[PDB]
């Protein structure tokens, strides 16, 4: 079906029409909108060993650390020692089914610290003194991308949203909501370390197949890159008169910028170039600031126009992950006690199909139009609009 643009209007006395339902419903509690509780994880803290005991026969350390994490979950320990207790498993395990449960060991253990911080059980300065640690940055930047591909990548590919997975929009997920503190509290004090951890995170993301390619990545997986990256982050005049190993970086970034500005070429490498250049721009502002080329190519607004579609498609995929569940929510994400049955809900007819029209109207309101952009913005958005209007009744 070739559904046209759902022309609507989100004005005063209409934002609270639906967000009020979103202010209390099961989804959107850990999310937000672009128009602008501990028992849930505790039940998984009980379900932590649903199947570990089934195949203990090698497979004993999984249950050995399982009950240890269960003990550490509910027991109250001073912050000066809780980190030492929890790091015993973190610094011990090195690395198919094994890792399928090893990640759940690491992922659930780290969620405790943020939960205690939300309850003011852990001092903020104590958290600061441990987040600056080098190894834990590598632990988190690895476990996030591993956990996402554990559950959401299986269903993302089928919908066709796999090609539009962006690393910098991962905190917006309801499950990965605790990262907001790890981001803002870290950037407020040590802002450089935020770009540092993002630079690492995209680096592991590239080589795990999130943004795969047959050619090497000349921007990541090398400490010497960050040397110049941080050198220009302080002196605002080291790029106008650059040293060597920096003309090379400019030559590899402007080439990708021209690739992005190109029209006919294959699209997957535009996707790869986008997921690189947006990361470098958001973490290292003023690194592709070609003051002459961008103005006569409308690059500054083109990047934002092609960026907004990613969040739009993420929200559409979230709605799809909600409709059929009423497991696409992901393994170890929703406990069976709080599971969602199959029955249709009356509140969906007033807050879901209407909200889709609001979302598409908000998508079709300030995005510029260009034939190159249309292949990047108009075509995928129209495909999503066609797909979203063929499944709501069923």
Partner 1 sequence: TLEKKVRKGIESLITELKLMQAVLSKVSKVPADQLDEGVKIWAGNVKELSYQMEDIVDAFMVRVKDLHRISAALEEVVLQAKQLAELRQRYEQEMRDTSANTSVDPRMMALYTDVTELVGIEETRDKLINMLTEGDDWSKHPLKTISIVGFGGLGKTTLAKAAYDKIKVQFDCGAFVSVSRNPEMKKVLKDILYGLDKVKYENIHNAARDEKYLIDDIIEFLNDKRYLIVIDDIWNEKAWELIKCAFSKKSPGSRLITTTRNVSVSEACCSSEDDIYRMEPLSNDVSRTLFCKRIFSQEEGCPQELLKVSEEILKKCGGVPLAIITIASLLANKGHIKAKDEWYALLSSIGHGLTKNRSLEQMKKILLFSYYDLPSYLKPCLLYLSIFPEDREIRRARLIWRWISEGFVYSEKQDISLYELGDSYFNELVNRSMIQPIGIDDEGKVKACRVHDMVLDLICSLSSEENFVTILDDPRRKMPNSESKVRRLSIQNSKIDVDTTRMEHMRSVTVFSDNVVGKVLDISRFKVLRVLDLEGCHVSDVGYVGNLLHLRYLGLKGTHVKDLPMEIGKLQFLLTLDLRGTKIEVLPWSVVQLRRLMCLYVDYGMKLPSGIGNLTFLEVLDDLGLSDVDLDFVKELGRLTKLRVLRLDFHGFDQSMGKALEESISNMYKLDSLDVFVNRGLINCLSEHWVPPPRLCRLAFPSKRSWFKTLPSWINPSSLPLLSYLDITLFEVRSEDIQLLGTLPALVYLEIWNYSVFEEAHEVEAPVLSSGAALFPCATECRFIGIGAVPSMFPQGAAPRLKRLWFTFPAKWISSENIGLGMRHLPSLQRVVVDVIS
Interaction of residue 237 with partner 1, rule CB under 8 A: yes
Asked if 12 is part of the footprint of partner 1 (rule: CB under 8 A), the reply reads no
Q: If binding is defined by CB under 8 A, does position 94 make contact with partner 1? A: no
In this chain, which of 53, 227, 251, 337 binds partner 1, going by CB under 8 A?
A: 227
Using the contact rule CB under 8 A, the part of the chain among 228-236, 254-262, 312-320, 377-385 near partner 1 is: 228-236
- Tell me which residues in 126-155 interact with partner 1 (CB under 8 A): 134
Closest CA to 45 of 26, 68, 72, 73: 73
How many binding residues for partner 1 (CB under 8 A)?
A: 13
Q: Count Cβ neighbours within 10 Å for each residue of 258-267 and write b for 16 or more, e otherwise.
A: eebeeeeeee
239 in Cβ contact with 225 (< 8 Å):
no
Nearer to partner 1, 66 or 194 (CB): 194
Where does this chain touch partner 1 (CB under 8 A) — which range of 52-60, 168-176, 229-237, 377-385? Answer: 229-237
The tally of CA atoms less than 13 A away on the side-chain side of residue 6 is: 20
Give least dist CB 120 to partner 1, A: 26
Task: Return contacts of 388-392, CB within 8 angstroms, 24+ apart.
Answer: 388/3, 388/316, 388/319, 388/320, 388/356, 389/1, 389/3, 390/1, 391/320, 391/323, 392/323, 392/352, 392/353, 392/356
Taken as a whole, the chain contains a residue count of 394
Nearer to partner 1, 244 or 343 (CB): 244
Residue 235 sits in the site that holds partner 1 (CB under 8 A): yes
Q: Is 393 in the site for partner 1 (CB under 8 A)?
A: no
Q: Cβ contacts of residue 381 below 8 Å, gap of 6+?
A: 309, 312, 360, 363, 364
Beta carbon nearer to partner 1, 176 or 226: 226
Residue 259 binds partner 1 (CB under 8 A): no
User: By CB under 8 A, is residue 234 in contact with partner 1?
Assistant: yes
Which one among 223, 341, 347, 393 touches partner 1, defined by CB under 8 A? 223
Is residue 34 part of the contact set for partner 1 (CB under 8 A)? no
Contacts of 138 (CB under 8 A, 6+ apart): 200
Stretch that binds partner 1, among 145-153, 234-242, 349-357, 372-380 (CB under 8 A): 234-242
The crossing angle, in degrees rounded to 10, of helices 191-207 and 267-283 is 160
Segment near partner 1 (CB under 8 A); pick from 46-54, 59-67, 181-189, 233-241: 233-241
Q: Report d(CA 150, CA 103) in Å as an integer.
A: 9
CB of 87 to partner 1, least distance (A): 18
The answer to whether residue 191 forms part of the interface with partner 1 (CB under 8 A) is: no
Q: Write the DSSP string, 87-135.
A: HHHHTT----HHHHHHHHHHHHHHHHHHHHHHTT-S-HHHHHHHHT-HH
Q: Is 19:33 a contact under the CB 8 Å cutoff?
A: yes
| Interface region with partner 1, contact rule CB under 8 A, candidates 11-19, 162-170, 219-227, 356-364 | 219-227
Segment near partner 1 (CB under 8 A), from 16-24, 181-189, 223-231, 290-298?
A: 223-231
Which of 76, 92, 224, 346 lies at the binding interface for partner 1 (CB under 8 A)? 224
DSSP-assigned letters across all residues of 21-72: HHTTSSTTSS---TT--HHHHHHHHHHTTSSGGGG----HHHHHHHHHHHHH
125 touching partner 1, by CB under 8 A: no
| Contact call for residue 230 and partner 1 (CB under 8 A) | yes
Residue 51 C-beta: closest distance to partner 1, Å: 35
Is 326 near partner 1 (CB under 8 A)?
A: no
* Helix axes 353-363 and 379-388, enclosed angle (nearest 10): 170
Q: 186, 193 in Cβ contact below 8 A?
A: yes
Residue numbers at the binding site for partner 1 (CB under 8 A)? 134, 216, 223-224, 226-227, 230-231, 234-237, 244
């Amino acid at each position: 079906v070739n559904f046209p643009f759902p022309k609507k209007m989100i004005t005063e006395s209409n934002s609270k029409d639906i967000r009020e339902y979103l202010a209390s419903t099961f989804p959107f509690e850990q999310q937000s909108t672009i128009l602008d509780q501990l028992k849930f994880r505790q039940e998984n803290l009980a379900e932590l060993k649903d199947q570990i005991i089934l195949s203990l026969g090698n497979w004993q350390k999984l249950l050995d650390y399982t009950n240890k994490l269960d003990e550490l979950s509910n027991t109250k320990i001073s912050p000066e020692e809780f980190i030492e207790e929890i790091q015993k498993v973190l610094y011990k395990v090195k690395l198919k089914l094994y890792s399928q449960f090893n990640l759940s060991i690491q992922d659930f253990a780290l969620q405790i610290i943020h939960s205690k911080y939300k309850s003011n059980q852990i001092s903020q300065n104590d958290l600061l003194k441990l987040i600056t640690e080098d190894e834990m940055l590598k632990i988190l930047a690895k476990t996030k991308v591993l956990t996402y591909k554990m559950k959401y990548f299986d269903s993302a590919s089928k919908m066709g949203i796999n090609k539009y997975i962006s690393t910098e929009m991962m905190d917006l997920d309801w499950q990965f909501s605790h990262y907001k503190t790890f981001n803002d509290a870290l950037k407020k004090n040590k802002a450089s370390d935020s770009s540092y951890l993002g630079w690492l995170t995209h680096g592991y993301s590239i080589k795990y197949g999130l943004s795969p390619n047959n050619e090497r990545s000349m921007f990541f997986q090398d400490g010497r890159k960050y040397a110049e990256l941080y050198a220009f982050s302080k002196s605002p005049h080291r790029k106008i008169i650059p040293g060597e190993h920096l003309k090379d970086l400019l030559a590899k970034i402007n080439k990708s910028k021209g690739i992005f500005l190109d029209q006919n070429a294959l699209l997957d490498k535009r996707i790869y170039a986008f997921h690189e250049l947006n990361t470098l721009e958001t973490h290292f502002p003023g690194i592709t600031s070609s003051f002459t080329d961008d103005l006569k190519s409308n690059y500054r607004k083109k990047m934002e126009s092609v960026s907004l579609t990613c969040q739009v498609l993420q929200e559409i995929g979230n709605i799809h992950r909600f409709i059929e569940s009423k497991t696409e929510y992901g393994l170890f994400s929703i406990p069976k006690i709080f599971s969602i049955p199959i029955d249709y809900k009356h509140g969906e007819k007033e807050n879901l199909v209407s909200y889709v029209d609001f979302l598409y109207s908000t998508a079709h309101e300030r995005i510029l139009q260009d034939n190159s952009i249309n292949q990047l913005c108009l075509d995928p958005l129209q495909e999503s609009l066609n797909r979203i209007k063929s499944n709501i009744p069923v």
